[PDB]
Amino acid sequence: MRECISIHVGQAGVQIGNACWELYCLEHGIQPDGQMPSDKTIGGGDDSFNTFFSETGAGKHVPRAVFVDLEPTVIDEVRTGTYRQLFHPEQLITGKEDAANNYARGHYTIGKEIIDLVLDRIRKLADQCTGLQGFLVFHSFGGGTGSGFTSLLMERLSVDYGKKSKLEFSIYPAPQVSTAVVEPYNSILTTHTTLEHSDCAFMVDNEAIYDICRRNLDIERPTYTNLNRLIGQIVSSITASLRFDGALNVDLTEFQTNLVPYPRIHFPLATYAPVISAEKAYHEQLSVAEITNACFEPANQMVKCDPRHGKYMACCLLYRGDVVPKDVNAAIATIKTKRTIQFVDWCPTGFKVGINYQPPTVVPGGDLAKVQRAVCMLSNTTAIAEAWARLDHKFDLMYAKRAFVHWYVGEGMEEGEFSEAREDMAALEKDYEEVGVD
């Protein structure tokens, strides 16, 4: 009866969730119709769909998600596609006009209209959940309705519901590859105002997944579709300790006590161990003792960042499938004897382990192979400080000639907060070099 709200705003997060919600219906028995099969039994206990789906007595199973976007064309293809008979037709909130890479077009001007139809579903969704535990938001930093509009939910949901952890998963802008011309601008605006209300905001990158899919999967010329089912498997391994059973169950209340040491050092990043194609995953032994070491590569990180320039602070190794807990324990002690994986002095423990009894799933027509085990580490490293070095220097050249500004100030937004959002992200960056001082 432990529940989770899954809000998908922006245009990236409504598109990941097309590939995220096909996976929960796949883990359990629920058809894209929404009904359950008459003949085939998947094996499901009785309430393991209780976390993400609200079963109704008519037989249909109804999901807990809100898909709001102000530009209408991306939810209108979910309103017509394979997953029409799944959702609630009042969930899918349609706007009228763009947000158009503008922070102030989505956060203040057009955002003041659509917000009360957004919140009057969330405060209805909470009243049917009797064991509610937190939020799972899906947006993107480099835009105008996943950046401006995420901090219009976050500065109201924190006001109403108070202290409940909120776990937003955002595509970080990549170093070399970039699409919008103004994403150094609207990145800083959505982290000055959401670092005060976030509890752990995970980071995903487009450039890193474009390379580990090139080599491990050994696919080439990839798409956006082949990226969304690698982000759909992380979040279905985070939320597997609320629907399944196992030795160590790490549920959502203590992700702030395991991963957040100081109240503004909550920016962790995640990987996933056995990503092998179907021609090489049967040609070697994939056991516990090496997929816990393939997690600690430089080349297996979902964020383009060298982990080796900063020391780890707290990990979390959420295992899955056929794992006995002796094999984890001799394998973590392999890690701390290595003088490359540098842990740091005020945290002798560092590691935190969960095990479970359900193997990985595979989508039909998938890119991944059938594997018994799965590891999804989540690490709070200090190397992500110099992922914020570049994106302040990107801000520091365009603001240095007042460039690109007047599309922001025209749509109800003061110029006075550009200087103090970059005053802020110094004061965020000054903390990571302060905590590393032993």
Next chain:
Amino acid sequence: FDQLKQFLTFDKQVLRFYAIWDDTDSLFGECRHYIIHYYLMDDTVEIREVHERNNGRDPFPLLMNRQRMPKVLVENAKNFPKCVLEISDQEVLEWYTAKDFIVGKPLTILGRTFFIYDCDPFTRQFYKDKFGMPDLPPVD
């Protein structure tokens, strides 16, 4: 035996039986409905309780966790320290197989006698294809 081959051949294939446990001979005994799952991937058995509305029981979904079920124990296994050790293949003479679950027969698991009265359409087809058994009629 290639455990990975069995897993890959029978992944998500579960035989589902409908059973009653008639305990009415006990002082507070009730005739109760159960679902028996047999997992073809690993030859494990799970027993689920069927709760009716207003049955006066605590809503626990499982009578028995998913595990491999011994049918016959070795004579020396009477002294096996079950309080510290799990039953290994050395203490078990015969394991429960898919052949032992038959509609209209009593099935004795952990000292409880279940009467299997029906099976799902998939299980019915699987028994026809694997064992050549004629149609398994539901018992009222």
Next chain:
Amino acid sequence: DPHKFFMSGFTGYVPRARFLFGSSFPVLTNQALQEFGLGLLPHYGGYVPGYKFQFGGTFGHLTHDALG
């Protein structure tokens, strides 16, 4: 079954013995191990059914039919 009892004063366990009363410890313990294996009377203050339709005879000869 002779010598199926317990002495008066045995601290220990005997089943079905919290649930039987009225006789001392050995007589109860034998029970606790075997279990482990014509007309009515005048001026009576009770009710004969049919006692609206009787006239003109004796309480003895009118309550005989109730027991026979």
Next chain:
Amino acid sequence: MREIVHLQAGQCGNQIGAKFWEVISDEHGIDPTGTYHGDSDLQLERINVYYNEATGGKYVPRAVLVDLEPGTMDSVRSGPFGQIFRPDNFVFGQSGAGNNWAKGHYTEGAELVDSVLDVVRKEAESCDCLQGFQLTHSLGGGTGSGMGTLLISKIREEYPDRIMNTFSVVPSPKVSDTVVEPYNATLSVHQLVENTDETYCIDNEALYDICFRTLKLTTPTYGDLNHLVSATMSGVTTCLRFPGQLNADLRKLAVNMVPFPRLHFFMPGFAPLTSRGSQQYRALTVPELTQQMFDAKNMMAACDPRHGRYLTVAAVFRGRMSMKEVDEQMLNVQNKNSSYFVEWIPNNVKTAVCDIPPRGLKMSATFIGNSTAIQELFKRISEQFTAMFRRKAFLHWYTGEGMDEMEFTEAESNMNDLVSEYQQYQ
């Protein structure tokens, strides 16, 4: 006739203590239905100690089962012997503790322990003569280490003069499975020195290595370590239920083994551990069980007992044995290595011989040690709490809940007390 109350808090204590009843009911002849099928007539005559008999003969246990996260009491009722308990005895909320000490003893614990102590009282009245309390602590965090001392500091307010029997899994020198582990340890040993009369230490490191070189397992899961714990746990209370030749209850085991008031943390063991291979290549008697008992590799707590002495050692005995064999072979072991005991008291061995062996053997024993080496197990948490403290690491999930900071030095100052007391008398 002399009953003991059992209490199950935390994750690690719920699961080991539910493996405790499948060893208890195995010795006495209860099938998982709950009715009685046993052969020997010596099981019945003292069945009342751990069990309550119910109308029909469904011998129901005497444990109380409290945890906040309800996912484990839906997971220990669903075991092989889970279906025997009292469903009135299950107490829970819905908000898990989250490995926080101030979610157990302070904030949510002000709700539920007012409804914990009146389910204890509903079975204290059905006991003829209570003498003790079992609790399965779990020191690895704040779900069974925080609110465990919320119960024993409330029970000890009620019953001043009764035995406390806590079996608590202890933190480990290896890499742990919780990052706030030195925080939550030192909070809960400030009160365990004031309300318990022993705290039988257990380490997951030693139980991965008893089963590595002696038993020689291949893949020891969590289902196998609990048999090692529950065998010692069921060996200490044998003189209460089974007839014996020197009978020793839990107060007989008290005045032997605590010299000064604050030296009661002990060390467990279990004698006849063999491989699956070399069982019939080995002959066991009293003088072979003694060498299997008195080595550092047969201790269930990850300390090396050759860096200290023993104040008092007791080894209960089960089976059909003589007692010149027992006593003279405890005289040799106090004589062959006499520099590993304390000179200021002459004798060091308490002997108790029962007349009933366990299932599947012909003789067994159980080793209980009170060493000075336990300060090494307390030196580490004294050493790795300080480095997590002076930078105020990981901290505001306590102080932001109901903690203070003035008791984070008033618990370390008592951690380093026990290191001083064990060492001073060495």
